[PDB]
Amino acid sequence: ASRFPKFSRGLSQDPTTRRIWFGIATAHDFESHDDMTEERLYQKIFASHFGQLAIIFLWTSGNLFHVAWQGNFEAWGQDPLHVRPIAHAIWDPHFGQPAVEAFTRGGASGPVNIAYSGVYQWWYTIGLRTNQDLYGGSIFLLFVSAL
Amino acid sequence: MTASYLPSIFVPLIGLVFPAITMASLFIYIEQDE
């Protein structure tokens, strides 16, 4: 409990490099830890579940915000057959001029990626028609993740 | 893109500086005997 893995003594007293590795591996096996009881385990499961939900909602809010900020959702709404949905913009300092000219397709002003996740059709079906709605959803999802 | 100056501010601050500091912090936390 005085070294990197504080939940196990066998890895703490390990002088080799293996102490690092098996510290990251057996990091979520709360059952086989030191001084574990059936009431600390369950509460750790509860808190980890809450953290997982927070991460999921943060991911969804990020998707919403990045489609609202850099995407072309409004344009796609009025022509969903002759336009490509933009996922986000790219800023790679290693790019060359032909790469910038190649990846600048769609309607964007710079180089961007094309969303192959189908979120455009989903959001358009359930009744979202403006970047303002996407931003509202994004801030609301930030709020619920904070909660 | 409204700002268009933020991607030049953040990815240098998230692909270069963020790992550079978190790896140092985690290396100090790993290689210590307390």
Partner: peptide, 29 residues
Amino acid sequence: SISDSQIIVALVSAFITGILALRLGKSLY
């Protein structure tokens, strides 16, 4: 987020959420 202030609102809200996650992680350890 076609506006300008809205990006700042998103940034500060993300920072608050980050502080909350920090406190939760400290409590989990």
